[PDB]
Amino acid sequence: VSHFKNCADKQLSDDKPLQCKIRNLQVDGNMPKVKEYMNCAFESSGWAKDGGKKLDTSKVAQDMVPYGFNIKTELDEVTKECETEFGAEISSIDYLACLLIDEKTKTQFKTMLMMKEADFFKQNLC
8 A cells, every 4th residue: 555645646636746746755834735645644654643743653663674674763763853843733744854854764764665655656746
């Protein structure tokens, strides 16, 4: 199951340009539809809890095992810093950005994401 493709096909079927930006990991929460999309994709991946307010790092870690990674402690640290920054207003797009910006997590997370969600990320969207 590609959670990212299923969310894109159901929320963004008429918005290939935004799908391209998502493919390129060049989106933020100020763009219309992005907070909604990323909550959809993180929730069906088992990552977003409480509608996007919390992140289950144990599920992220589970998903990374087939790619040879185990950085659960780093995921916990980055997630905690993200929560301190955004507080009650946090959502999945913020957790994504935190993971993609931190040297502790970004390359491992992107490898898992590109491989596990290949059915979305491989598409000719741009």
